Curated annotation (Swiss-Prot):
In the C-terminal section; belongs to the aminoglycoside phosphotransferase family. The lineage of its organism: Bacteria, Bacillati, Bacillota, Bacilli, Bacillales. GO terms for biological process: response to antibiotic. It catalyses: a gentamycin + GTP = a gentamycin 2''-phosphate + GDP + H(+). It comes from Staphylococcus aureus. The chain holds residues 182 to 479 of 479 of the full protein. The active site is at D191. Involved in resistance to gentamicin, tobramycin, and kanamycin. Tobramycin and kanamycin resistance is due to the ACC activity, specified by N-terminal region. The C-terminal region is a kinase that phosphorylates several 4,6-disubstituted aminoglycosides. This is Bifunctional AAC/APH.
């Protein structure tokens, strides 16, 4: 605990010549990464070598801070160090409160509507950017899945159970029949969940973070979490209304897209385990297949 922060304090002061760390605490973490609040003022996202890295994320912030017109704040990178083994991005903390189901349920109907409009407006503005200058950041989700399926076939597929194989083949049958990858491509946040959305003191959208998965990809991508029915997200109705306010988009296919990504999740989890040599993820994905198969 107190040892991570010393190591990171050292790396920050070593790589950014004039920077002095008066305070530093862990503010969040993924499975590959750790984030730190420094001097009660700066966020520092960090990562050590992992199927990389923070170069794309930086190029995305730089593209967006040049091209977006919006009052919604996003990270603006002041400090970056990027190497094969280590990557650090520092920027000023955007202040606010993260959106949650609980907060949402306390908002008046009109407060909720204004938030949904704020979100639809943000997404419309980003999805509308001429992305020529960030064109290297393309992502083909369908092709990625095919390549991941090939990796499964080359590694553990033959040891899976019949129930597990059927789940996967049935997913691939669905992938092959769907049309939801054939639509408009644009620059998407691509991890647009309510834990990345910041509210100000009037419960209006004041900022957005973590454009780490951003790319030129299906327009439907940015509604996947807004449409999710779970304890972490607000609800299907929230995403529906946002889709209506956003306009010019096939809502039923947005939902199909979301449903297909949800079906893929256990396989994604297995694949992450294969690629990063973590048996624990392989087993969680496989077990999740049994859970889904037996649910009614
Ligand atoms: N309030 C605030 N919190 C921030 C800001 N930047 C990051 N955070 C906090 O730090 C956490 C992690 O930041 P995030 O960019 O989501 O990183 P990640 O998923 O954990 N890393 P990765 O993008 O490499 O997978 C966020 O959940 C949030 O608590 C910011 O500008 N303001
Ligand atoms: Cl296993
Ligand atoms: Mg995040
Ligand atoms: Mg992230």
């Amino acid at each position: 605990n107190a040892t991570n922060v010393k190591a990171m304090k050292y790396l920050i002061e070593h790589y950014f010549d004039n920077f002095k760390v008066d305070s530093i605490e862990i503010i969040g973490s993924g499975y590959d990464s750790v984030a730190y609040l420094v001097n009660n003022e700066y966020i520092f996202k960090t990562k050590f070598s992992t199927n990389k890295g923070y170069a794309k994320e930086k190029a995305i912030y730089n593209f967006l801070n040049t091209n977006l017109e919006t009052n919604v704040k996003i990270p603006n990178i002041e400090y970056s160090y990027i190497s094969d083994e280590l990557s650090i991005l520092g920027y000023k903390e955007i202040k606010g409160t993260f959106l949650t189901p609980e907060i949402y349920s306390t908002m008046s109907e009109e407060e909720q509507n204004l938030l949904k409009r704020d979100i639809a407006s943000f997404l419309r503005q980003m999805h509308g950017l001429d992305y020529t200058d960030i064109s290297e950041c393309t992502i083909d989700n369908k092709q990625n899945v095919l390549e991941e399926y090939i990796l499964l076939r080359e590694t553990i597929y033959n040891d899976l159970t019949d129930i597990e194989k059927d789940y996967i083949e049935s997913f691939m049958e669905r992938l092959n029949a769907t049309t939801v990858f054939e639509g408009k491509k644009c620059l998407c946040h691509n991890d647009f969940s309510c834990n990345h959305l910041l509210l100000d003191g009037n419960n209006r959208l004041t900022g957005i973070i973590d454009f780490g998965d951003s790319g030129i990809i299906d327009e439907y991508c940015d509604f996947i979490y807004l449409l999710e029915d779970s304890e972490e997200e607000i609800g299907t109705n929230f995403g529906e209304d946002i889709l209506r306010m956003y306009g010019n988009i096939d809502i039923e296919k947005a939902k199909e897209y979301q449903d297909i990504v949800e079906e893929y999740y256990p396989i994604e989890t297995i694949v992450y385990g294969i690629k990063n040599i973590k048996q624990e993820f392989i087993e969680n994905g496989r077990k999740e297949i049994y859970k889904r198969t037996y649910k009614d």
